[PDB]
């Protein structure tokens, strides 16, 4: 006997060790083992199948069924569900979605690595595309001369935003080697999912998007790039190369454990 070195309580340590060993034993497969076309057996829940007194796989409580997987999608930070070709799902869903933890075995593996199933695009996805963002500067024209350069409001907002003959807005283009950004969070979210340089890198990693955006705000380069064009919003006019350099420099330091994020989500929804 040696005293375990842990900050957790004794009973909590027992529970953690027991759950870890049970997860390793009862659930020996993950998202890795399911390329497209892979035939796998899945142990469904008590619904639609009978409880069995005689069980063959480790910790099998229900009957299994053999089927083929099209891919895998993520229903959580560390939780993944496999998409099958059978359409029932005990509902009107076009394809079933079952947690990969329910898998008990695989008979044949499809070619290639595990395939991320491409769910059908929703109108929300089309409306919230990367290119749907505002493209060029939109400045107000309250005084006489027509604006030709993009400038901050510079306290014109503070003393006069209610009295005006009309709030004429003129669209002014920017230099081709710059980005115009209205929402930093949305721009950095659509980026790292659709940009080519950052497209397929983060399938395995989870990034702290909010912390990354706050750090990007704290970076004095983007601070210099800030331009105030409206009263209650801040837009950025930053060179493409500078933005990409800053993003590449800051990004790898803002990764977090998927398991910890999943546990935080579980404790949040449970409470």
């Amino acid at each position: 006997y040696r005293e375990p070195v842990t900050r957790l309580t004794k009973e909590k340590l027992e529970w953690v060790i027991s759950r870890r060993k049970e997860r390793k034993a009862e659930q020996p497969f993950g998202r890795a083992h399911f390329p497209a076309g892979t035939r796998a057996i899945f142990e469904s829940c008590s619904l639609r199948y009978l409880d069995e007194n005689e069980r063959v796989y480790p910790g099998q409580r229900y009957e299994t069924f053999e089927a083929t997987v099209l891919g895998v999608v993520a229903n959580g930070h560390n939780s993944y569900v496999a998409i099958l070709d059978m359409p029932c799902d005990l509902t009107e869903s076009r394809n079933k979605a079952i947690n990969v933890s329910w898998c008990r075995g695989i008979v044949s593996r499809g070619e290639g690595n595990f395939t991320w199933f491409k769910e059908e695009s929703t109108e929300y996805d089309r409306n919230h595309g990367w290119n749907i963002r505002e493209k060029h500067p939109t400045v107000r024209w309250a005084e006489g001369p027509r604006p030709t350069k993009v400038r901050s409001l510079t306290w014109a907002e503070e003393f006069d935003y209610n009295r005006a003959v009309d709030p004429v807005y003129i669209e002014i283009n920017k230099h081709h080697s710059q980005y115009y950004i209205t929402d930093m969070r949305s721009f950095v979210m659509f980026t790292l999912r659709e940009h080519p340089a950052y497209a397929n890198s983060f399938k395995d990693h989870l990034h702290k998007l909010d912390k990354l955006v706050m750090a990007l705000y704290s970076d004095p380069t983007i601070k210099a790039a800030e331009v105030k064009l409206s009263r209650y919003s801040v837009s950025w006019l930053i060179s493409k190369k500078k933005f990409h350099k800053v993003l590449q420099r800051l990004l790898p330091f803002y990764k977090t454990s998927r398991r910890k994020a999943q546990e935080e989500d579980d404790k949040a929804i449970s409470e």
Partner: protein, 188 residues
């Protein structure tokens, strides 16, 4: 040592060049520890007197941007090479407790009567000047006194010879080097 400034809410090359010929101003920045950098305009005449002052470089200078007052130290001077005149300053804020590296001139106060001068051939060459410094702003070394009245002919003065008084360190001595300061040799 006192100086008033402005905001300079206009950046770039043409905007920076128009200030020098039209208004005779000089841009600048105020970057520090706990605050963001702030661009600043200044008058060439006002900077000229401070530059003409001897110990103005190694001294805390109050800066009046608007009504805002701040203790500002100068540790940079961009200067036009061809004609010769001050360009944008790039001076630094002074926090009450910070290491605050800067540059300090030398004087070589006592060289009228020296051993190598009066006894042997008399020549004194000041190899280095504007020695760096690293000390808190609570005590400002305006200058460092060097005495060469006892150094004989053929001897040289290292950085370790002269002393940095009252809690002042030398970055060059923190490095693995000890530079010569002055020499006494024979005239050709």
């Amino acid at each position: 040592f006192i100086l008033n400034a402005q905001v300079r809410s206009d950046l770039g090359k043409g905007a920076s060049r128009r200030l020098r010929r039209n208004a005779g101003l000089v841009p600048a920045v105020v970057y520090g520890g706990d605050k963001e950098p702030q661009s600043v305009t200044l008058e060439l005449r006002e900077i000229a007197k401070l530059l003409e002052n001897e110990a103005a470089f190694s001294h805390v200078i109050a800066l009046n941007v608007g009504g805002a007052k701040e203790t500002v130290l100068i540790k940079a001077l961009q200067r036009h090479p061809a004609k010769g005149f001050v360009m944008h300053a790039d001076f630094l804020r002074v926090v009450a407790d910070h290491k605050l590296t800067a540059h300090v001139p030398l004087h070589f106060i006592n060289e009228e009567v020296a051993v190598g001068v009066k006894q042997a051939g008399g020549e004194i060459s000041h190899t280095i000047s504007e020695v760096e410094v690293s000390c808190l702003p609570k005590d400002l070394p305006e200058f460092i006194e060097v005495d060469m009245a006892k150094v004989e002919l053929g001897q040289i003065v290292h950085l370790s010879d002269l002393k940095a008084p009252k809690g002042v360190e030398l970055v060059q001595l923190a490095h693995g080097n000890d530079l010569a300061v002055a020499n006494i040799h024979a005239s050709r």
